[PDB]
Structure formats: structure tokens, C-alpha cells
Design a protein around this ligand. Structure first.
Ligand code: NA
Ligand code: NA
Ligand code: NA
Ligand code: NA
Length: 449
């Protein structure tokens, strides 16, 4: 059965939010094009309680050994917006195709970029190997200069043992700033690791795991309590193949706080431009295969919690809502958190460029338990109902906290199996208390007559 991240009250967290935001990748100041008013809109429309907040190595460490505390001030400012609205934050050290420094035309400055993004220019060593224009961005991964930049980072070439050490110490700098931040729950060490010339389990169990171990150790010099979240290699594994990632040791006193944060991008959904016919058949197989592989690696890592850190699609495609609902149902059964890709404007996201909602908003805006006083064994919801079964824990005194959308709960609530402590119609938060002396408790929440 699944394991959960916990809040300071000991409640088990069911995490629902977005990646915010891809616009940070190219921004000179490292910040997403996302305001406090945008967060208020998100919360009002969907009741989210989590964010995978994109940060970047190029912003943390713009020159070797010279950390930018002003950038960290900016991150802290945004984290405060989230804190004020009761969100938990996972910071993602984000890259795609290594760096903006992989081409001159795509480099928005010092490794920032709209396509390639992440590492600072000083950490990018392509050794003069070419990077030719490609018709979709993912193809840059296999261009010679990008492959070489990764091979140098992982020190496959033997020429750059320092780069992983810089990466680990950049994470330590972030962790030193955020250790005492009560809204931060997780550090996602690297978006979509790619091995370059080294592929599969030899990469994952070799230099990838070694970087995760070094970085975990560095973070634990300054932060004992934040969950350290590790990803498999993305290529193949995103598409349903197994990971060879191996266990990371957590030097913290007591129980380990490592979590697993894989992504889900079925190939048939992409190539088929939607979720109908044989593409749907094969995407459903992918989801199920992915679930089994994800559960396996989460066991290997020490029976750890899971966060689906990224998944998404163009919501206008045939079958999109069915796909989204399938993924969220799977995450629910797995006890997984979810950060959807992404909050950015356009048909993948919740809002179009003019601020109009896509179908994503209504799809995501469902009741869910946010923080449960005990282990949630099973739950379900529809627009106007939620049911939740809880394995009791008498040590927890904080109430179970549940989001109820206005759409289905226009007035008061009726709760079977628990006492209502609070029903805040402004914040949309229901708080309930359940007995801890009668075994597993089932709570059913419906609109008042
Ligand atoms: Na900058
Ligand atoms: Na460079
Ligand atoms: Na924290
Ligand atoms: Na340990």
C-alpha cells in the first residue's frame, strides 16, 4: 500500500496542482510569468494545494561558486504567495535539452532559454559538436552537442568531474534558504535526467544515482526534513519502460524522506494526436505498465511516496478529458500526488492566452481530500459527492481537510461518518473529525438539502 508525505500535524497529504511555469525557463530573472492574482484565480477555479515550482541551476549559480541570493529572494517571495493560500511547494531544478547555451540563437542569457534551458553557460561543454535546428524540441536531445554536454556533466568523458559537485552544492544553497520554510515539502533534484551516450540502468544506477546521493548528502548538511525527490531517466520510462534507478541513502536521523517523482508521457497519445481508437488502447496499456513500473521503483527506493511530477496534453484533442480522468484515477489509486504540465497559457493549460478556460478547469475542479488525519485507504469523488476511508491514527489531533467546489456544494454540507469542525465557504475547505477507536472510518460528504 502507498506511503504519503506528511504535514507538521502528521496528516497524510494528497497533492494536486500544476507545474508553474515553463515561462520561467527563459526569464532573465528566473521567475515565471505568473502573478499573485494568477494564483488566486487558480485556487478559486480548481482548489489546488500543490505546485511543482520551476527553478534553474543557471539562476542559482550564475558563475561557478557564486550563488545568487537575490534570485533565491525572488523564489522565496513566490513561495510566500503559495504559503498564504495553503499550498505545499516542490522546487524543481528544471532543465530541458541541458541549457539555453546549446545554441547562440536560443540562449536568452547565461543558459536561460525558451527551448533549451537549465544549466548555466559555464557548465555547458559541447566541445564544438553541432546542434542543428530540429522540427520538434525533443529531437535536440540526440544532437551531438547536446549529447556531449550531458556526457561532460555526468563525467562520462572523464573531463569534468567537478560539474556534479557544483550541482550538489547549488542544491545545498537552495536547501539552506528553504529548510525553515513551512510551505516547502519537497526538492525535485533534476527534471527528466538524460544520460547522453549512456542509457538505461547503467546510467540510472551509475552516475544518476551517484549524483542523487551526493546531492542528498549535501542537502542534509542544511535541511533534515524536506523530502528529496528523485526521478528515473525520462526517455523510455516516461513511455512505460522500467527504470533501473537504485536506492538512495538518506542520512537524516529516523525514517528516510526520499520520494519518487516520475513523469508520464505515453507515446501513442503523442504520435496519434489524441486518445481514440488503437492509440487509446495502447495509451491505456502504457498507463497500466507505467503504474506497475512506478510501484516497483518506489519499493526499490524504500517503499517511498510517489508524485506524478509531470503529465499533460493539448486538451482539444479527441478523448483528452477521458485521458486526464484516467491518469488522475490512477494517481488516486496509487496514492500519488500530481502536478499537471502546466499552468502556462494555451490549450495544454487551464487558460488560453485571453484568460478563457480550457476544458481542463472543469475536469480538475473536483472534491478531494487535501490532508487526512490517518492513511487514506480509498476515496472517490464526483461533482457533488466525496467518499473517503481512513485508517485511524489517534496521535493526530488536526482535522481531516477536504476541498469542496462551489459548483456541486452551493450551500452547506452533510457528512456521514465524521463530525464537521469547519465549513469555510470562502476557502472551500471542509474540516472534519473522525473516531480513532472504531477501526477504519468511511466519511461521505454530500450537499445539504
Ligand atoms: Na538572471
Ligand atoms: Na559553455
Ligand atoms: Na518545509
Ligand atoms: Na537513512
Amino acid at each position: 500500500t502507498p506511503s504519503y508525505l506528511k504535514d507538521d500535524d502528521g496528516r497524510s497529504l494528497i497533492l494536486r496542482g500544476f507545474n508553474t511555469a515553463s515561462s520561467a525557463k527563459s526569464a532573465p530573472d528566473g521567475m515565471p510569468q505568473f502573478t499573485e492574482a494568477d494564483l488566486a484565480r487558480e485556487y478559486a477555479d480548481m482548489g489546488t494545494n500543490f505546485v511543482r515550482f520551476l527553478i534553474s541551476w543557471r539562476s542559482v549559480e550564475p558563475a561557478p561558486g557564486v550563488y545568487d541570493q537575490q534570485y533565491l529572494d525572488r523564489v522565496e517571495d513566490r513561495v510566500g504567495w503559495y504559503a498564504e493560500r495553503g499550498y505545499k511547494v516542490m522546487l524543481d531544478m528544471h532543465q530541458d535539452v541541458y541549457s539555453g547555451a546549446i545554441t547562440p540563437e536560443g540562449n536568452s542569457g547565461n543558459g536561460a532559454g525558451a527551448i533549451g534551458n537549465g544549466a548555466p553557460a559555464w557548465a555547458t561543454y559541447m566541445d564544438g559538436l553541432p546542434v542543428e535546428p530540429q522540427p520538434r524540441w525533443e529531437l535536440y536531445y540526440i544532437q551531438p552537442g547536446v549529447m556531449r554536454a550531458f556526457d561532460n556533466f555526468w563525467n562520462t568523458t572523464g573531463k569534468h568531474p567537478e560539474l556534479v559537485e557544483h550541482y550538489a552544492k547549488a542544491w545545498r544553497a537552495v536547501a539552506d534558504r528553504f529548510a525553515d520554510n513551512d510551505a516547502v515539502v519537497a526538492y525535485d533534484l533534476m527534471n527528466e535526467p538524460f544520460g547522453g551516450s549512456l542509457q538505461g540502468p547503467a546510467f540510472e544506477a551509475g552516475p544518476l544515482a551517484a549524483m542523487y546521493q551526493r546531492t542528498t548528502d549535501a542537502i542534509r548538511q542544511v535541511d533534515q526534513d524536506t523530502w528529496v525527490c528523485v526521478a528515473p531517466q525520462a526517455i523510455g520510462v516516461n513511455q512505460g519502460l522500467p527504470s533501473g534507478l537504485t536506492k538512495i541513502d538518506d542520512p537524516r536521523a529516523g525514517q528516510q524522506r526520499i520520494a519518487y517523482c516520475p513523469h508520464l508521457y505515453p507515446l501513442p497519445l503523442d504520435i496519434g494526436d489524441g486518445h481514440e481508437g488503437l492509440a487509446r488502447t495502447l495509451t491505456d496499456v502504457t498507463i497500466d505498465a507505467w503504474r506497475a513500473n512506478t510501484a516497483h521503483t518506489a519499493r526499490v527506493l524504500g517503499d517511498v511516496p510517489i508524485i506524478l511530477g509531470s503529465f499533460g496534453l493539448d486538451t482539444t484533442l479527441p478523448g483528452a478529458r477521458d485521458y486526464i480522468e484516467r491518469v488522475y484515477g490512477t494517481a488516486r489509486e496509487m496514492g500519488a500526488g500530481v502536478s499537471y504540465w502546466s499552468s502556462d497559457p494555451g490549450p495544454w493549460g487551464p487558460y488560453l492566452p485571453d484568460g478563457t478556460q480550457t476544458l481542463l478547469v472543469d475536469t480538475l475542479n473536483k472534491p478531494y481530500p487535501r490532508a487526512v488525519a490517518g492513511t487514506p485507504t480509498e476515496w472517490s469523488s464526483t461533482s457533488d459527492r466525496l467518499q473517503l476511508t481512513i485508517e485511524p491514527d489517534a496521535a493526530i489531533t488536526a482535522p481531516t481537510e477536504i476541498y469542496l467546489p462551489e459548483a456541486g456544494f452551493p450551500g452547506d454540507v452533510h457528512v456521514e461518518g465524521a463530525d464537521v469542525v469547519g465549513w469555510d465557504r470562502q476557502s472551500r475547505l471542509l474540516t472534519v473529525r473522525t473516531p480513532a477507536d472504531s477501526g477504519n472510518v468511511t466519511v461521505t460528504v454530500t450537499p445539504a438539502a
